[model samples]
Target: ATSQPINFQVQKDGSSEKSHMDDYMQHPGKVIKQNNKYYFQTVLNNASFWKEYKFYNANNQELATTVVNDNKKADTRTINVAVEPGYKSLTTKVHIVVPQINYNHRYTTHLEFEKAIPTLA
Candidate 1:
């Protein structure tokens, strides 16, 4: 019962020996289409809760590889990323291990937003 970090609360890179458990933050929201199917979504959280997602483009290149589903305790999860239509700017990366009961009492935030489209018509 000693994960450390409980004295000065936590600061200096959010503690954990200067951040671990895989920090997170990915933004790519701008690519809408229906009929032809070309969806892109990347909004994740941090502070830990078993988080990991991937979808890169705009030269970064690494299309599709999702795994995001945060349940209760704070409630907020959405990682529905699909690409294949004039892709441009969609880089995401959110990795938080989920331990200590998911960062304990919660205290995490990650931002992601990008856009590109040409379908559903």
Candidate 2:
């Protein structure tokens, strides 16, 4: 299979849209699928930090939530998401978001639902 890096953009709920400051800070989002679940893996690079991951279904409805509680945020964390069994079709989509913390400014990394998907046969 192939893995593509996720482009991260800094999103502010009510910030100026034309700031032209997209993705002040960015990192590759390693996403993978195993068995009956999907995992959004990432490393903060910073040893000490707190972050959260929000998962969404094809309907854009929030599915589940997880957080990286590691005091030393240097390890790769896999945010696991298990949707309904019927969501095995290739058309199935899952959204992921990472809210920023300890960054210069407040922002979020919005990720598309259908990128860097892994498969096994």
Top-scoring candidate (TM-score)? 2
Q: lDDT values of the candidates?
A: 0.41, 0.39
lDDT of 2 by residue, 3-121 (tens): 34444333333442322222222266544445656554444333222233344555667666455444343444334344443332111122223336424333333343333344523
Give the top-scoring candidate (lDDT): 1
TM-score of each: 0.27, 0.39
lDDT of 1 by residue, 1-121 (tens): 0111111111122233422312332333334455656655433444245445555665666666444465466544655566665553344444445576544332332122223244434
Kindly give the number of clashing pairs for every candidate.
11, 1
Could you tell me how far off, in angstroms, the CA of residue 57 lies in candidate 1 after the best superposition?
Answer: 1.9
